[PDB]
Design a protein around this nucleic acid. Sequence first.
RNA 1: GAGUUUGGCGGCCAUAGCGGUAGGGCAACUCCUGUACCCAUCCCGAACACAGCAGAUAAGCCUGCCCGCGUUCCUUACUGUACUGAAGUGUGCGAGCCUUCGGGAACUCUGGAUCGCUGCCAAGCUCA
RNA 2: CCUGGGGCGGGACGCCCUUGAAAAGAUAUCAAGGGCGCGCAAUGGUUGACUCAAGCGGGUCGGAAACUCGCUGAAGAGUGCAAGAGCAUAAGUCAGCCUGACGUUAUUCAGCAUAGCAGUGGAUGACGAGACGAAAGUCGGCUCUAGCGAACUUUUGAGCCUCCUUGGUGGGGGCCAAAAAUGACAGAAAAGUUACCCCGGGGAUAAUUGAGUCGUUGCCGGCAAGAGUACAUAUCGACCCGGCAGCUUGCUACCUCGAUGUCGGUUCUUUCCAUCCUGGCCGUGCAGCAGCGGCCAAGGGUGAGGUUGUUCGCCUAUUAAA
RNA 3: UCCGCUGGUUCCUUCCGAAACAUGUCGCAGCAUGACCUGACUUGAGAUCGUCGGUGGAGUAGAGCACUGAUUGGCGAUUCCGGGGUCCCUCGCUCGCUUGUCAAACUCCAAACCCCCCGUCAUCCUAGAAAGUCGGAGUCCGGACUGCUGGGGUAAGCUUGUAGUCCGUAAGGGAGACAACCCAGCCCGUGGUUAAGGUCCCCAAGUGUCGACUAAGUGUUAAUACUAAAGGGCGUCCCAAGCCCCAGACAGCUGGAAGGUUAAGCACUUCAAAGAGUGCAGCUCACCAGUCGAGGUUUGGGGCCCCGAAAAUUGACGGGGCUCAAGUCGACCACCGAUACCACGGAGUACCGCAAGGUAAUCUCGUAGGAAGGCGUUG
Lengths: 153, 96, 159, 174
Amino acid sequence: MYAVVRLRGQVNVRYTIEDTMKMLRLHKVNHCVFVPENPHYKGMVQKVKDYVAYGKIDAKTLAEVLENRGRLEGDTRLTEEYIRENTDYDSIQAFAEAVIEGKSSLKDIPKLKPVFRLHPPRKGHAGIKRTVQQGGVLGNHDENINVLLHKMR
Amino acid sequence: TNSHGEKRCTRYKLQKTVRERGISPVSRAIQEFEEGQMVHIDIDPSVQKGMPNPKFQGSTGKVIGQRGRSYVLEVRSGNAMKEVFSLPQHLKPQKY
Amino acid sequence: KPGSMYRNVRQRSFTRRKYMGGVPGSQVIHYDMGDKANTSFPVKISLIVEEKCQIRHTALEAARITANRHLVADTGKMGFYMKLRVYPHEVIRENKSGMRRAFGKNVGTAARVKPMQKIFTVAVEKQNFKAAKEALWHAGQKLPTPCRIVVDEGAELVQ
Amino acid sequence: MATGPRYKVPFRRRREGRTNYHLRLKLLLSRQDRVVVRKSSRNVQIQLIAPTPDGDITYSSAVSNELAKYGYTGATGNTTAAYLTGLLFGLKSLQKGYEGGILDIGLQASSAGSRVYAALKGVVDSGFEIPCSPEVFPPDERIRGEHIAGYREESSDLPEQFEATKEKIFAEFS
RNA sequence: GAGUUUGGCGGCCAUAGCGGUAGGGCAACUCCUGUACCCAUCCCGAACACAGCAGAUAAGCCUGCCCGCGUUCCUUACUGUACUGAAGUGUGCGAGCCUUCGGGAACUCUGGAUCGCUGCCAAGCUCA
RNA sequence: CCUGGGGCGGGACGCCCUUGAAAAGAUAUCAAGGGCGCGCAAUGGUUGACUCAAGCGGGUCGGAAACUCGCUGAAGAGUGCAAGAGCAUAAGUCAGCCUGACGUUAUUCAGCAUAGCAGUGGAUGACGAGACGAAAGUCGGCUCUAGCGAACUUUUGAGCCUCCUUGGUGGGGGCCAAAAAUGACAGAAAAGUUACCCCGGGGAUAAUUGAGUCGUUGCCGGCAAGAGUACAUAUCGACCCGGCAGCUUGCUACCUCGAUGUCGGUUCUUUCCAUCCUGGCCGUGCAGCAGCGGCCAAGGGUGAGGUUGUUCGCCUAUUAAA
RNA sequence: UCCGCUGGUUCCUUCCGAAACAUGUCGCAGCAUGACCUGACUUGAGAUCGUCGGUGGAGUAGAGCACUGAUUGGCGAUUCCGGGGUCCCUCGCUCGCUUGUCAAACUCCAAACCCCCCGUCAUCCUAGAAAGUCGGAGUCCGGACUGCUGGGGUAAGCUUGUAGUCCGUAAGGGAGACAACCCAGCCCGUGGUUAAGGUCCCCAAGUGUCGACUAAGUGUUAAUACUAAAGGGCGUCCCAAGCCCCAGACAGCUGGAAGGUUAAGCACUUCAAAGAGUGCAGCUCACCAGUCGAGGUUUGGGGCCCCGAAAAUUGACGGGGCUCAAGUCGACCACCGAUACCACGGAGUACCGCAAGGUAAUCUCGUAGGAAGGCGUUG
Ligand SMILES: [Mg+2]
Ligand SMILES: [Mg+2]
Ligand SMILES: [Mg+2]
Ligand SMILES: [Mg+2]
Ligand SMILES: [Mg+2]
Ligand SMILES: [Mg+2]
Ligand SMILES: [Mg+2]
């Protein structure tokens, strides 16, 4: 499961890349979306590598992301009670485990927004002018996206 | 000044490869096409009759009718739909 | 007309001489110097250019003259074989008024050379290696590019 | 002599001198079956052919080797044998369900009173429909085989056996 | 019901061409035999056309072979080189060039293969 | 009218092909190569029969120049003419027969991508007539892409409608089609001059200063080919290559046209050093005197006169130098 | 009078928001038509800005000589068409084998982007897809940055194109100032954390950490119209490889350059140790012996610095100043720092709902201009 977070703005960005972002539902910086691992989404995330950061999120990171930055319709925070009344699992942690194990989805939750408006990264990040392999933050973090997601908790 | 003729800038659009120059395969000229079938426009430069523009070279046309030997194609040129008359020698079916 | 004018490579290749008019030919006379028959020279070195530059035919002729004279005075007339690999194929045209109808007349030819492309190849004996290398050093001083010498044959024969 | 990579070899049938492709393109535009009449030096053969992109397919055929079973004994490569083969092909193609087709002599030269036009007249006389002009048809005595008196008296069996084969084949297919 | 051979019509139009050697025809094909006639020569029955008993597989044709030339394909190296899509507070005085992620040759080289594949119909034979 | 200001020149002012043009399409410049304003009753159509250019070989003064036979020959020829594309049992050549180089009419293309836009073409068809051919087919000219022109007016072709109450006669008006041209080619019937000039605007655009650039100009450097009796480097420094200055002329059009008073001189002040003299050194092919070349150095000096409006330059006599 | 030319054209808010381009024009300072913007209406279910896979178009970069043309030698023959001192024989073209270069009007080859169509995912969509009709315009002086070695040009803050994004019409934060360079697209107030960039002082936060380099005040200048080259350096710091090398080299200190030759040196039989010879006929090196007693020399590829390097009012790393840095390089840590992001409260807008009200990550910038709603004067 790619965890794609936007880290650069929409100024001086080409229309194809900006529409790629818009179909990914990433209109502003510090916005995260969780998407499956099919080749279609892999190509879409590859097209916007210079303006986002993506990786393979683990279950604990997604659990804390749902617990601290999940919003329903009307801008209402997600909690444990809504999860238990609209899913089969014991808490947000078990639902995150199910989502990582592929037998669940984020669309299982009724009314849940597909965009996680995250906080800016605590103690900054590595920079938006170099990729991950150049010492920056853009591009593919692999499993190290969870460190960046943790610092943007 | 430059010209505005129909064959303008078709040095390689309307050129045949070295080992397909000469007579073409005659089976390409009797390929019947159905209504609504998608066919590729790949112009045969040897057949000088019933040819579309070079500007439609490489466009997929939907067959909508027949006008004798040639076929009626609904071709797309940028943002407009065009009706392009082409004989079967210049068309080629799309395979799935 | 200094070589800095017709030096940088920012234009496409103007070489089809059947669609142009009256190119003044190159002053470069020969392209082989020394022993043109002995293929048994063990130590072979080449002068390579490390930029993308257009060498005028007059520059090539001056470099060839200095290198050939140094090699003839160093290793004798038949103790070396020196090869100028590149022909000047590009036609250099100057806008000889103002900028109206600016496509100029041909005022000479030149050779467009890529980075690391060998200009002169020199084949010499073991003892005449230093003289050939130093003459090739003098040859590149008459060229518009930074040039470094590279050894083709007998790298172990020298060191 | 394919001297280099810029050498365009002809098509395989054209390399073998067996097919003209310009005439083939002219004939295939009809969208009709071709009466592909081919004559060999010792007998004659006629086919009905319809093209498909996998290759040509032949519906019906008839050669001079079939004339033995209908009571024919003479030469199988003359005008009379060509007429009998054409008549048999026409009746057999009518029986199978084919009654039309354009003539196709291929690379063989066109000349009136040939074996090919004799086969064409045999096809026309069997009820098979093929557009043709009667000028290129042979005379009736030539189809009967009235050449015989010039050289050989053993050729005199030709007209009676031709009439016998004609009546036998007409009774056979009708 | 199946197979081999032969013939006609082909499809893909060199992997099929160019070249060299070795084998075969019962049926077939061809070479080959004549010119009464049909037809014909810008002259020649050379071709075409007609009528064909022979004789010959010497050629057409079929089978196998030779990498020699051409083509096609793989393969190791060149090489993830050339070139390039995107981004870059990376870099050069400058013509420019570099890093990251994603594509990716051509020539040549090593070791090999390719001297066609296949579709229809018919004539025969040999079915189990 | 376009126009690296205008003018002179030119027509990139209409049509056609290759590149430019960055492998769909489009894409400008006074961009590069150019061409067209026609020719042809056959140099056209169709059927049949053949294959061309150029080599090698054989044939008699028929020469290495003719015509003829064999072999190689996918095209290296020809197809009327630019360029590009097409074509070999042919889109070529020859011969038989012919006139489809036919009357009428509908679509869609492309001139004019996307996306409106004239008369025109150019590809499919349709009605009616034919030509050649066994038939399939081919023929709406000459293989495809240039060879041409609105409205009005006149003339001409076939048959019809019409002219003011009605019928006729002469004569007009009209429909459809063809010809006559506007080349500034989407169509004025069209020469200059103004320093006697006027007006409205323009830094949308030039002389002007300024800015950018540096071909050219001034001053240099590298490598040293050599001359210097010998000796590259005391002195001169070819060829080739790389620069600096912006002090000459150019290029450009960024600022200024509701004005930045435009050359030269004079007066006065200042600045740079790439130093002419004065000060200090180094080399010499420096004996001294006097030169020659180079380095440091901008404190001071660098004048008076003849011609010319001059800058510049020459000339005169002084002068440390002028 | 007329003018396509100049100047001016008077209140507020809200919604949306361009074009400086094509064709024709006595057209080039103008206009029309189309693209682009806006408002309304009809229509009724799909649309493609994006991804992945496939059927197709490639003829550009690159590459190469297989065509068209150029281009360099060598080797062997054109017994022939040709040039020269019994056509005795010289001999340049021409044809093959092996080399050396090319193309914008070359291609046996040949990408990455890209374009048409199909399937899938994705997004938009009955709160109205694509299509259609009508009302209103503005607009056809554009310019810049990053690429295309774009074309031309000696170059140009030059001129003319193309793809994307900007300024025009773009705030706020930062580069010293900066139309278009980076963050960022922005309703109001508060709190927090970050972006770009910076942390010696001017100035909030580092006289921060590790490992080296620079000795020149070099530098303290991302992009750039704002930044000097060729050439050279036994300046200094590295990597690698030849050669001599504790059977004792390199550089210094002791005996000799004695046989020879005056072949007028400077126009050997055989010895470890002496030439047809380095130098101001003795005056001097190359060379063997001894000697301290250990590295020496050559070449190639790199980093920084230096010479090359001269301009005009006194002056510009932004200034002060800075030397194991306050400079350069390879990494790292913590903090500072926006109106961005998060949160809270509030306003407006869009659509839906009968209404209460509901939704908005997928609403809030704005020139020419379209549309809507209001304020004001006089009657
Ligand atoms: Mg004018
Ligand atoms: Mg007067
Ligand atoms: Mg190239
Ligand atoms: Mg920008
Ligand atoms: Mg904007
Ligand atoms: Mg700003
Ligand atoms: Mg407005």
